[PDB]
């Protein structure tokens, strides 16, 4: 059993907790804002039996006892913005820079996640986020914590990025 420590970061309100809860507990956080838990789930991924630790961090606008500790321990990161929140997408760069600083490494397993892809209108274009992720050298995956679309894709891609590291 290999343990994978995955950290979800991003600005407030983008769906960090919704995504984590959707993956671990298979239901949609229709406003249940936890106040930065940690989660574990045993799952078989690509024939490997894994223990996933999901560390759900708070945005930099909010008090957080554990975000710095969660970030130092994490092996891979989901960098999450909401496709209807332009500031959240602009904040991605700070979040990535800080991950690189805490891990003391430029080659940290990461996935850029554009969440809320269920929505009818958006202010951040896929092409933008794909170009930014390309410049970072990481995958871009669009997700919906509401519909569960792409959620396992995001988290498992992170796991496979950790395996390649």
Ligand X SMILES: Nc1nc2c(ncn2[C@@H]2O[C@H](COP(=O)(O)OP(=O)(O)O)[C@@H](O)[C@H]2O)c(=O)[nH]1
Give contact residues for ligand X (rule: CB under 6 A).
10, 12-18, 29-31, 33, 115-116, 118-119, 144-146
Which does residue 118 touch among Mg ion, ligand X, none (CB within 5 to 8 A, set by kind)?
ligand X
How far apart are CB 128 and ligand X at their closest, in Å?
18
How far apart are CB 2 and ligand X at their closest, in Å?
27
How far apart are CB 58 and Mg ion at their closest, in Å?
6
Residue nearest to Mg ion (CB): 17
Long-range interactions of 18-21: CB distance < 8 A, separation 24+? 18/115, 18/145, 18/146, 19/78, 19/80, 19/113, 19/115, 19/143, 19/145, 19/151, 19/154, 19/155, 20/54, 20/56, 21/145
Q: Between residue 7 and residue 36, which ones bind Mg ion under the rule CB under 5 A?
A: 16-17
CA distance 111 to 153: 10
How far apart are CB 15 and Mg ion at their closest, in Å?
8
Residue 115 within binding range of Mg ion, rule CB under 5 A: no
- Pairing between strand 110-115 and 2-10? unpaired
CA distance 147 to 114: 14
- The nearer residue to ligand X, 103 or 116, going by C-beta atoms, is 116
Which does residue 18 touch among ligand X, Mg ion, none (CB within 5 to 8 A, set by kind)?
ligand X
């Amino acid at each position: 059993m290999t343990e994978y420590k995955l950290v979800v970061v991003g600005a407030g309100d983008v769906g960090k907790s919704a995504l984590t809860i959707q993956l671990i507990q298979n239901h949609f956080v229709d406003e249940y804002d936890p106040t930065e838990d940690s989660y574990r789930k045993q799952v078989v991924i690509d024939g490997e039996t894994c223990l996933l630790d999901i560390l759900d961090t708070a945005g930099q606008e909010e008090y957080s006892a554990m975000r710095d500790q969660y970030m130092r321990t994490g092996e891979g990161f989901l960098c999450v913005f909401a496709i209807n929140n332009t500031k959240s997408f602009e904040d991605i760069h700070q979040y990535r820079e800080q991950i690189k600083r805490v891990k003391d490494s430029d080659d940290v397993p990461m996935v850029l996640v554009g969440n809320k892809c269920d929505l009818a209108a958006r202010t951040v274009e896929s092409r933008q986020a794909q170009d930014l992720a390309r410049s970072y050298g990481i995958p871009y995956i669009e997700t919906s914590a509401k519909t569960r679309q792409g959620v396992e894709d995001a988290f498992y891609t992170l796991v496979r990025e950790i395996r390649q590291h």
